[PDB]
Structure formats: structure tokens, C-alpha cells
């Protein structure tokens, strides 16, 4: 039955994973770049906490940004329901994917397959886009879906991703939050393969136990202390079995990761996921020797310090042209700090800024909307330097001073930190600041959009203040040199010196 208020199907355990994946990919969904799977106790009863709410909201935001798939129980019981709510909220403000897996026997109501729909034990989730049901049998027998779920994950992990980073593979991170009887089994079966999991060291009782562990008597004591009710109710015979699982879970720690309780930063979730994936990739040992792929993987996420300390190390061959591709991507990927690291770690910017690379950057990555806005602005005002800049961009789209071209490109797209980083390298430092202030002030009075005018005015004022302070210090150092710099005219930067630009842009403060 498919109901609209995504397709909902009932599947037998004999269904082939390959065919199901082929259907899901070819028919409805697009290529998956990452799979986040959440495992929590199937019990409906649950208690929310402020930190858990924030953590899961940030997880959903990260998944949406990357475009990962989300797999959950989808039984409309407690936490899962909240997750669905969050998804719907993000749908209100290209689309998130949330697959729920459950069993036919649990479902209270059954409707035969036009479209058959019903509006309303264990009622199914309402916000989940796609749902599946297990129809093996044993209506009264629960906990049947688990097996199939695992078979679904592994096939995805082993299959080639045919995508950049992670050595042509897929993350498939496994997640743990909360304590449950089936949580240990799920974690053990996930860790059996090369599937790293991260466990939140928060409310989760079993999660707290696992975090604390990182002897049989010690494990038993910890388990008894943390979950007195479950241990007391459970028979002694089963406990031994549980211990075995724990051992395996604790035997392999390189895959296992835990979130620190003290940490309160926003990016804690991203840090944990990135570190876990980095551990897995490095310990794979199939491609651990190489450093280009690892550097790219760490660049995809904004882990600059870890990437530095690991990849670059000390007394390690950095290569002369190795950083070319990574820094090119960083410039495309808008990672100012990585660009600064590359520049200060040995990269030669003058050599890299070749004619071909600049032509490629200006030809395609240039925003079409920005191109049209610049064309209309040049048509309207057409000042002395507007024609110069427009001619330069047109020439590159079809005594070179490529640095000024790169700086202009960075400014035109309203990038603050990257623009400042590029500014810290130019030769004509002061004149560039005045030119940028004039260029921003030209558009400051567009009046089409209220917000962008404020941002542009603030940027122009900041550049003006920087220029004023720089020249003040320069004059306080040497008087005659400052005057010579004032009279000096750059190598056709705009055909004008600092004074002319300052007077043209009605810069009263600079002249005063």
C-alpha cells in the first residue's frame, strides 16, 4: 500500500538485497553519498533531554547539507517520532531522505493494495517519507526485521561508491544513542564488518557503560550498576552471552568512537564523525601509505588542525606540486583556512596562478548572476575602473598581474575571509583596499535587496578603515616615503593612484 498524506511495501526475508538496491536507486532515489543509521531501543517509552535534542537537530542539518540517507526503526514510538518531526520541520524551511524499517506483525492495521490508504499495536511513523515492512510471518513474533537490515547495510558498504573521496567507497557510519537490549546486538553485528560506530556518552545507559569501559568481573559490575532493573529482571544464563558481545565491542577500539561529555561546541558531531571515518580509512591499510586521498578526505570536512598535524607531520616529504590539486579544490570549496595553510606551508602562489588555471576559474566557476549584475552595473554607471575590470573578466572568459585578478574575483562574490587572505599577499596593498572600497560603495545603493546593501556597506567600511590605519602607520614610520607612495602610481592597477581613488569615492576621513 502506497499512501499520500512515499511508497510503502511489504517484503519477505528472501528478497535479494541487490534487486532492492537497484529499485531504490534507479527508480526513485539518487546516488547516496553517505548513510547515517540510528539504532535505539524499540521500546516506545523514552525521555528527551536538551542536549539530545540539539545533537539530533545538528545531525539532521549535517545530513541535509551532505545529502545522506537516514535509516531508523520508524515505529512512531518515542525518539523516532521526534526525528520525523524534525525532518518535517526542515522540509518547511534538495529533499531529505528518511527510510524506516519495521515488521508486518507489529503493525496493528493491515490494508490490501489505485492507492489504498488509512488514516490514524506499534502504529507506524507518519513523517517518514519511505517505509518498508517485513512479511516473513509470525504475526505475534517480534524482532524479525533486524537480520534483513544488516544485509542491507553491508552490501552498500562493500559496493564501489564511484564517488570522490574515501577511496571510491561510502561512509556508512553507524550511530548509537540510548540503551536497549537489541542495541548491543545491532552494534556487535555492525562492528563485525568494517562499519565504524560512534556512541553518545550521554543518557544512554548501555552507551554510558561502553564509554566507561574504554575484566569479566568489572564488566558485570558496571552492567549491574548502570542497569539494575534490566539485569535483575534478566536471567543469569543470558548475562554470560551479553558479556561475550561486550568483549568484542571492547576488543576493537579503533573503529569505536565516543563523544566527550565536557565538549559543548556546535561542531562536536561533525568532529566525531570525521575522526571516526578518518580512523577507519587510515586503519584500512589497503591505501594507508598514500597521503593525497587522506588529505582530500580531511579537506571535505573542516578539520584543519587534525589534517595539518596528521598529513603534513614533521620532516615529511611535502612535494612541490602535490598541494596544487588540494588547494585548487579548497579555492572551489571555499575553505579559507586550508588555503592559508597551503600558502604558508610551502606553496608558491605566483607559480600556480598560471594563465590556464585562471582562465578555467574565470570561465566556468564565475557566477552567471554575478556576471549579469556586473554587466548591468557597468551599463548604468560605467566609471573609470568598471570598464577596466569588465574588460579583464571578458578577456579571461574568452605585466599580467594575476594576483589582482584573483583578488577582484574573490571580492566580486562577497567573500570576506578569502578576500582578506588574498589581500595579505598583494604588492599594491593600500591601493587595492581603496579600489575595493570604491567598488563596494558603487553597489551599496542598489536598493533591490535590503540585506546585501548592509553587508556590502560594512565590508567597504572595514576595508576603508584598514587602509586608513595602514597609511597612518606607514606615515608615522617614514614621512618622505609615505609621500612618495602617495604620488606613486601602480602598474596600471586602475590608471590612478591612492589619492585619486580616495577623492573619487568621497573618502573624507582618509583625506582628513
Amino acid at each position: 500500500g502506497d499512501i499520500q498524506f512515499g511508497k510503502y511495501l511489504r517484503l519477505s526475508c528472501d528478497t535479494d538485497s541487490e534487486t532492492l538496491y537497484e529499485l531504490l536507486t534507479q527508480h526513485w532515489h539518487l546516488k547516496t553519498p553517505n548513510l547515517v543509521i540510528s539504532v535505539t531501543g524499540g521500546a516506545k517509552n523514552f525521555a528527551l533531554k536538551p542536549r539530545m535534542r540539539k545533537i539530533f537537530s545538528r545531525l539532521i542539518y549535517i545530513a541535509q547539507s551532505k545529502g545522506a540517507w537516514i535509516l531508523t526503526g520508524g515505529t512512531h514510538y518515542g525518539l523516532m517520532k521526534y526525528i520525523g518531526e524534525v525532518v518535517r520541520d526542515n522540509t518547511i524551511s534538495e529533499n531529505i531522505v528518511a527510510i524506516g524499517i519495521a515488521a508486518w506483525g507489529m503493525v496493528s492495521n493491515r490494508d490490501t493494495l489505485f492507492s489504498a490508504q488509512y488514516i490514524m499495536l506499534y502504529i507506524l511513523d507518519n513523517n517518514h517519507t519511505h517505509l518498508l515492512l517485513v512479511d516473513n510471518g509470525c504475526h505475534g513474533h517480534p524482532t524479525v526485521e533486524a537480520k534483513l537490515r544488516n544485509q542491507l547495510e553491508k552490501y552498500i558498504s562493500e559496493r564501489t561508491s564511484q564517488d570522490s573521496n574515501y577511496g571510491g567507497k561510502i561512509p556508512i557510519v553507524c550511530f548509537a544513542q540510548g540503551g536497549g537490549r537489541e542495541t548491543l546486538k545491532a552494534i556487535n553485528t555492525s562492528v563485525k564488518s568494517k562499519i565504524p560506530c560512534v556512541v553518545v556518552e550521554g543518557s544512554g545507559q548501555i552507551a554510558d557503560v561502553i564509554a566507561s569501559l574504554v575484566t569479566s568481573s568489572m564488566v558485570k559490575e558496571k552492567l549491574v550498576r548502570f542497569l539494575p532493573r534490566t539485569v535483575s529482571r534478566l536471567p543469569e544464563e543470558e548475562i554470560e552471552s551479553w558479556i561475550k558481545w561486550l568483549k568484542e565491542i571492547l576488543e576493537s577500539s579503533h573503529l569505536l568512537t565516543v563523544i566527550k561529555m565536557e565538549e559543548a561546541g556546535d561542531e562536536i558531531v561533525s568532529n566525531a564523525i570525521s575522526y571516526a571515518l578518518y580512523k577507519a580509512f587510515s586503519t584500512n591499510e589497503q591505501d594507508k601509505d598514500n597521503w593525497n586521498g587522506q588529505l582530500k578526505l580531511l579537506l571535505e570536512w573542516n578539520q584543519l588542525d587534525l589534517a595539518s598535524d596528521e598529513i603534513f607531520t614533521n620532516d615529511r616529504r611535502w612535494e612541490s606540486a602535490d598541494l596544487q590539486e588540494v588547494m585548487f579544490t579548497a579555492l572551489i570549496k571555499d575553505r579559507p583556512k586550508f588555503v592559508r595553510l597551503f600558502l604558508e606551508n610551502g606553496l608558491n602562489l605566483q607559480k600556480f596562478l598560471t594563465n590556464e588555471v585562471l582562465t578555467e576559474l574565470f570561465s566556468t566557476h564565475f557566477s552567471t548572476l554575478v556576471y549579469r549584475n556586473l554587466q548591468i552595473a557597468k551599463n548604468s554607471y560605467n566609471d573609470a575602473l568598471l570598464t577596466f575590470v569588465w574588460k579583464l573578466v571578458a578577456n579571461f572568459r574568452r605585466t599580467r598581474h594575476p594576483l589582482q585578478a584573483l583578488f577582484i574575483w574573490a571580492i566580486l562574490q562577497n567573500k570576506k575571509e578569502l578576500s582578506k587572505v588574498i589581500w595579505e599577499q598583494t604588492k599594491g596593498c593600500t591601493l587595492a583596499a581603496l579600489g575595493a572600497s570604491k567598488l563596494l560603495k558603487t553597489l551599496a545603493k542598489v536598493k533591490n535587496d535590503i540585506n546585501a546593501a548592509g553587508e556590502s556597506e560594512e565590508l567597504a567600511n572595514e576595508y576603508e578603515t584598514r587602509a586608513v590605519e595602514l597609511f597612518t602607520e606607514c606615515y608615522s614610520n617614514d614621512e618622505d616615503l609615505a609621500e612618495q607612495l602617495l604620488v606613486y602610481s601602480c602598474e596600471a592597477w586602475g590608471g590612478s593612484n591612492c589619492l585619486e581613488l580616495a577623492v573619487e569615492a568621497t573618502d573624507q576621513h582618509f583625506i582628513a
Binding site: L9, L11, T15, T19, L23, H27
Partner: peptide
């Protein structure tokens, strides 16, 4: 259209 082939595919 697709539903028939899908149903036959899983059976």
C-alpha cells in the same frame, strides 16, 4: 505502469 513490473519483480 511501473507498479505492475515492480510487483512482478518482487513477487
Amino acid at each position: 505502469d511501473l507498479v505492475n513490473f515492480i510487483q512482478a519483480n518482487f513477487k
